[PDB]
Ligand binder design. Structure first.
Ligand SMILES: COc1ccc2nc(-c3ccccc3F)sc2c1
Length: 425
């Protein structure tokens, strides 16, 4: 009964060929050519980094990693609080088909070990404040040959920074603008290994490329407008943070970051950076339903607040911020990014929105498995090319989640309405 399978429409702009590395390289190269185009802004220290800086350093890291001997048989871990440097090794690795495993930077040694025992990285990039945990983990995982320091210019405590690592490995006369990223099979080559005990979620490059179609979609993403700035407190190592940010880079936006929440810094940043869009994890929505300080800031450039909710809290937050509603999205680590998203300007309080392009969604009767019609409640199941290739070295868990037909069973109860909006119950 195809009428009861909700399908995404055609993408505004058709799905681009190329790896995720190649598409990020191509977009970023263009922005790099316009001086002063801002990529990231650290709200705490107030430092800006431009696309030219970001592009050049990413390309230098890609080439240095290649000369060091990394290739598609290798993985790297990136372990760090949100920062200006976080995406440099992520981009450099995607440029060369090296899989990236973000490790949650508040994981202790035990959680870290389990994460990295699944990802098995050869090189670990880490912030200064994570160095000790990584040193303690390296002891039990000798596969880690090299630790590189992210937020340092010079060597740090006997370890190379990203800058001196690059200098150690670049050929003479290296040209960042002549560099060409690696081409490979984007379905077979893993881009990201995300954590979901925790398991490892393998995401081929293909899932990111589809995300980049959604990201710049005027209905399912953000329209590419100049001088667009986003404020993001979301962890970069979590799919919500990872896949929104990569998409913002494709778009040329200014990504203003915070690595720890504070009420004044956050509202003052919205005001002073004239933020157009803001990202909140769910507990920060409850937080701003309680806030009264919002009223004291000029938030007239704010177009949207995006949520990775209860209909009550979302309604209150929208009102406090003087917005028509909340831009909700629903996704799992296992689906790369959001597979249901509030279509631009067509929000419904309490809905998670509509099926994104390339995807499909249904709800099924709980004890049965039978597909259901409008306004009927059952388990949400989704099918599309952003679904993980699988949990790493764990086929039983993978087969328990995704059926022989490619349907991923979300575990959540939902229903969809006559306009094809989904509601999670
Ligand atoms: C509001 O728009 C968005 C855009 C991306 C997005 N990703 C989400 C997600 C991705 C991975 C894991 C968990 C998530 F909630 S929710 C969401 C919502």
């Amino acid at each position: 009964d195809a009428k009861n399978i909700k399908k995404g429409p055609a993408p505004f702009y058709p799905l681009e060929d190329g790896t995720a590395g190649e598409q990020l390289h191509k977009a970023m190269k263009r922005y790099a050519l316009v001086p002063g185009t801002i990529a990231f802004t650290d709200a705490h220290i107030e430092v800006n980094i431009t696309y030219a800086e970001y592009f050049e350093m990413s390309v230098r890291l890609a080439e240095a990693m290649k000369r060091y001997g990394l290739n598609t048989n290798h993985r790297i871990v990136v372990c760090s609080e949100n920062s200006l440097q976080f995406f440099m090794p992520v981009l450099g690795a995607l440029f060369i088909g090296v899989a990236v495993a973000p490790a949650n930077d508040i994981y202790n040694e035990r959680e870290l070990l389990n994460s990295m025992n699944i990802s098995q990285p050869t090189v670990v990039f880490v912030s200064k404040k994570g160095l000790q945990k990584i040193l303690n983990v390296q002891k039990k995982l000798p596969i880690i040959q090299k630790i590189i320091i992210m937020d340092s210019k010079t060597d740090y405590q006997g370890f190379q920074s990203m800058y001196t690592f690059v200098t150690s490995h670049l050929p003479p006369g290296f040209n960042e603008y002549d560099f060409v990223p690696e081409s490979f099979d984007r379905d077979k080559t893993i881009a990201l290994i995300m954590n979901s005990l925790p398991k490892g979620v393998a995401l081929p490059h293909r899932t990111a490329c589809v995300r980049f179609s959604h990201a710049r979609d005027p209905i399912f993403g953000n329209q590419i407008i100049p001088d667009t700035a986003i404020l993001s407190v979301v962890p970069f190592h979590h799919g919500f943070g990872m896949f929104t940010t990569l998409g913002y880079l494709i778009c040329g936006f200014r990504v203003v970051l915070m690595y720890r929440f504070e009420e004044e810094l956050f509202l003052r940043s919205l005001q002073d950076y004239k933020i157009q869009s803001a990202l909140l994890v769910p507990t920060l929505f409850s937080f701003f339903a309680k806030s009264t300080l919002i009223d004291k800031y000029d938030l007239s450039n704010l177009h949207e607040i995006a949520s990775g909710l209860s209909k009550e809290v979302g309604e209150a937050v929208a009102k406090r911020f003087h917005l028509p509603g909340i831009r909700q999205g629903y996704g799992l680590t296992e689906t790369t990014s959001a597979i249901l998203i509030t279509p631009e300007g067509d929000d419904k309080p309490g809905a998670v929105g509509k099926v994104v392009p390339f995807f499909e969604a249904k709800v099924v009767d709980l004890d049965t498995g039978k597909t259901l019609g409008v306004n009927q409640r059952g388990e949400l199941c989704v099918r599309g090319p952003m679904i993980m290739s699988g949990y790493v070295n764990n086929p039983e868990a993978t087969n328990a989640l995704i059926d022989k037909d490619g349907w991923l069973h979300s575990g959540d109860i939902a229903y969809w309405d006559e306009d094809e909006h989904f509601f999670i119950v």
